[model samples]
Target chain A: RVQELPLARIKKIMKLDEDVKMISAEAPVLFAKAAQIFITELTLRAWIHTEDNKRRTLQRNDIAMAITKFDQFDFLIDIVPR
Target chain B: DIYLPIANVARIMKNAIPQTGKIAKDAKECVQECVSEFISFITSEASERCHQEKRKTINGEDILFAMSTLGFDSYVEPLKLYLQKFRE
Candidate 1:
């Protein structure tokens, strides 16, 4: 599968936490894939909200709605303020 | 805040939609922050596992294990297959 996210950037982001020391070459690859899946899931959820509201474009409010609507996205509640 | 590029995020969001859907700038910004937070969140979990094992390096396996333990069960199987393909 093609990776859209940059591996170096992902590795850099992972190292942002001081607790993280070294990262294997394969770690970033795995992360890129996971991130893609994450983006898709969140986007789709937000799309549902947009459609339900009779809006054609996806908006920040829709994303906020989706995050609050699902328990799986609870970790993001604080970051995505309503 | 170190976030993913807005253009790339929008592109991914666009791909997920089957129809000709548009994305608001605010939505892209929100997604950027969320994606950054997600990377940090999962990395922290994987890093913790490495520390507990006295290992300094975080590997693909550690990340997969972390995802499984952290309620991201949907991501585990797909990532597992991707990992296997990468090794080949």
Candidate 2:
């Protein structure tokens, strides 16, 4: 079944409490979908690292390695630990 | 070792020629130079990415992502699947 992200959740994330007020109802849905794809891509990359070194579990290093593996993910460098 | 060998690349270019299509005698050498330049181009792009990320070791995904970044996402799936077979 197709799912719609909660409107309130999306609005809150857009920082409704801040100076921002109104947004297109569809805006949150788009952001939510984009975030989902980003996570999926990140997870697949992390999975690739974990599968290596003969390990079955995904480690923190796997996530770090995954982010470090892509140039486009360079923006995430500060977040991923060495 | 990671780069595709020139002979295999030559074979690929050779096969790309239609049966009725005539290939020059020096086709292999041409493909060799082109393949070498192509590998260097992608590797440099990948290295820049690695450096920007402040990472030391180069990962296979770096190359894949480089390819994708260079607008070659069409090749990513085939390359990823092929690399997966090698990883296994």
lDDT of 2 by residue, B1-88 (tens): 1222344433443343333433333433433333333344444565566667766444456566666786546556655554444346
Q: Write the per-residue lDDT of candidate 2 for residues A1-82, one digit (tens) a residue.
A: 0123343554454432232343433333333333333344555566576567556544556667876888755555655645
Q: Given the true complex, what DockQ would model 2 score?
A: 0.01
lDDT of 1 by residue, B1-88 (tens): 6776778878888888766788988899999888888888888998888878889899777888888888897898888888788778
Model 1 reproduces a share of the real contacts of 0.84
Find the candidate with the highest DockQ and give its number: 1
Model 1 ranges with Cα > 4 A deviation: none
In terms of docking quality, model 1 is high
Model-by-model DockQ, in order = 0.83, 0.01
**Residue A72 lDDT in candidate 2:** 54
How displaced is residue B83 in candidate 2, in Å? 1.2
Per-residue lDDT tens digits for candidate 1, residues A1-82, read 3366788888888888877779999999988888788888899999998999888899998999899988778899988867
Candidate 2 clashing pairs?
Answer: none
* Model 2 stretches with alpha carbons more than 4 Å out: A1-82, B1-7
